[PDB]
Amino acid sequence: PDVDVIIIGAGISGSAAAKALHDQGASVLVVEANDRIGGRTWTEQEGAPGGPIDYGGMFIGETHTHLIELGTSLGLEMTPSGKPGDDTYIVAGNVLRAPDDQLDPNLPFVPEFLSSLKALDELADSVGWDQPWASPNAAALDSKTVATWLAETIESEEVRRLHTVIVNTLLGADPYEVSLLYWAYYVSECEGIQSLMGTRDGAQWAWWFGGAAQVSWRIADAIGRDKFLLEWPVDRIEHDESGVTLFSGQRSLRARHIVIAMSPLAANQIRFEPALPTSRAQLQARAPMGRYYKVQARYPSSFWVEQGYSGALLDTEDVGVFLLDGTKPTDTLATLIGFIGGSNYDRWAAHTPQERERAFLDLLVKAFGPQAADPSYFHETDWTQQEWAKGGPVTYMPPGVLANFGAALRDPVGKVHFAGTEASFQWSGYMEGGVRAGQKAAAAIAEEL
Ligand SMILES: Cc1cc2nc3c(=O)[nH]c(=O)nc-3n(C[C@H](O)[C@H](O)[C@H](O)COP(=O)(O)OP(=O)(O)OC[C@H]3O[C@@H](n4cnc5c(N)ncnc54)[C@H](O)[C@@H]3O)c2cc1C
C-alpha cells in the first residue's frame, strides 16, 4: 500500500479531506482527473482584466463556519459580498425595485408569494436535513415533482414563475424534473430559502480576495504540492478487506483507505470491483448535475450601485436569471455576475453565443441603464459542458431516489468512504458542505487507524 489514504478528487472537499488526514499524521495522496487543483471552484487570478475571476463557486455564507475557519487558517482574507442599494425584480417583463428585498405590498402577486415562501419553509421542516428519506411524508413528497407541487398549491401565475427561477437557479434544474422531497430537503439543509436567497447575507455574504480556488491550492502547498497528482483520472477501483487499488489506465496506486470526493454522478463514471451495493449504485446513476451558465460582465464603474441599486436582481422571463454584484474593493473593474440554469440554460444554449450575450446585456440595460450596453469584458462559462464537473452548480434528484437510497450519500462501502459536498449533512451543494464532508470523511478514516 503506497500510502494510508488516497483521496480521489482535488476539489475543496477532497482537499479539505487531505489536509485533515495529513495534519493527523496519515500518509496521503490526492489523485486528480484533470490539470487544475480547483474544484467547481475555478479561479484565474491574472487571467482576465479588472481582477481575479471565479468561474465556479465564490460566495461564502455567513454561517459557513468550516469554510471560514479553513480559509483563515490558510491565511486567506475575506471581503463582504454585499452592496448598498435596492434589489431588483423583473417580473412579467416589468422592472420592480425592492428596498431591502421588500417589494411593494400592493403588488398583486406579493402576498401569495410570501405565503407560498412560508409554505416552502414549512415543508422543508417536515422532512429534515439528517434523514429526509425517513420523514413521514417522504413517500408522498418524493413521488411528485416540484412542478406539480407549484401547480397544485399556487394561484398566481407570477408566484409560480418566481418559484421556478428560484429552483432553476439554486439547482441547475427546473421544477419539472426535480423531486419535491428533494427540494424540501435542500431548503431544509441550507437553512431555508431566506438564507438560500440572501443578497447581502445568508449564503451570499462574503468572498476570498484572490479567488475561491485558493483554499485548495493553499492546502496543496501546505500539504506538499508533490502529493497532488494531476491528470490522474481514476477509472477502476478494486477494493477488498485489506485496502484499495486505484487504476488510471495502466498506472495504479494502493492505499489502506480512499475517499472519493466528487459528485455521485462523477463517481458513477468509475468501475468498482466488486460492484457497489445496489442503493449506492442506484443513487449514483440517478442523481444528475444541473444545466448552468455563469455569465460575467465588467465595466469601468459600478453604475448600478452609483444609481442606488445593489446590482442584485431576479428575472422571471426576460432571460431567467439571478444577477449579483461581484465587485471586490481590490478589483479595478466593476463586475456584475449572472446565473442561468435549468430550462433557462436549455433556452439560451439553443441560441448563438452572440445572441446570448446580446440578450444578457439587454437585460442588464433594462435594469441598470445604457451604461450596461457596452462592457469592458464579458465571459460565459457553460458548466453543463465542463468535462469533469459534467454540469449545473449542484446535484439534484428526480422523484423516486432520495427517499429510497438517500443514505447511500453518506454510508461508506467497506474501505471506500464518501466526501464531496453531496455527502455533507448540511450545506450540501456548497463549498461549506464540501469542506465538512471532507473533514468528516477524514475523521472516520482517522478513527479506522
Ligand atoms: C457556476 C457555479 C457557481 C457556484 N457558486 C457557489 C457559491 O457561490 N458558493 C458555494 O458554496 N458553492 C457554489 N457552487 C458549488 C461549489 O462550487 C461546490 O459545491 C463545491 O465546489 C463542490 O466541491 P467538491 O469538492 O465536493 O466537488 P468538485 O468541486 O466537483 O471536485 C471534484 C473533483 O474530482 C475530480 N474528479 C472527477 N472525476 C474524477 C476521476 N474519475 N478521477 C479523479 N478525479 C476525478 C474533479 O476534476 C474535481 O477536481 C457553485 C457551482 C457552480 C458550478
Numbering used by the authors: 30 to 478
Quote the study's own text.
The active site of CHAO is located in a buried cavity located at the interface of the substrate- and cofactor-binding domains. An examination of the three dimensional atomic structure of CHAO reveals that the overall fold is substantially similar to that of the human MAO B monomer, with a RMSD of 1.1 Å for the coordinates of the α-carbon atoms.
The structure of the CHAO·FAD·cyclohexanone ternary complex was solved by molecular replacement using the structure of the holoenzyme monomer as a search model. As with the holoenzyme, the ternary complex crystallized with four molecules per asymmetric unit. The peak is relatively weak however, indicating that the occupancy of the active site by cyclohexanone is not 100%. Modeling of cyclohexanone into this electron density results in the plane of the cyclohexanone ring being oriented perpendicular to the flavin ring, with the oxygen atom rotated towards the FAD cofactor at a distance of 3.7 Å from the flavin N5 atom. In this position, the cyclohexanone molecule is sandwiched between the aromatic side chains of Y321, F368 and Y459. The side chain of F368 is positioned near the cyclohexanone molecule, with its aromatic ring coplanar with the six-membered ring of cyclohexanone.
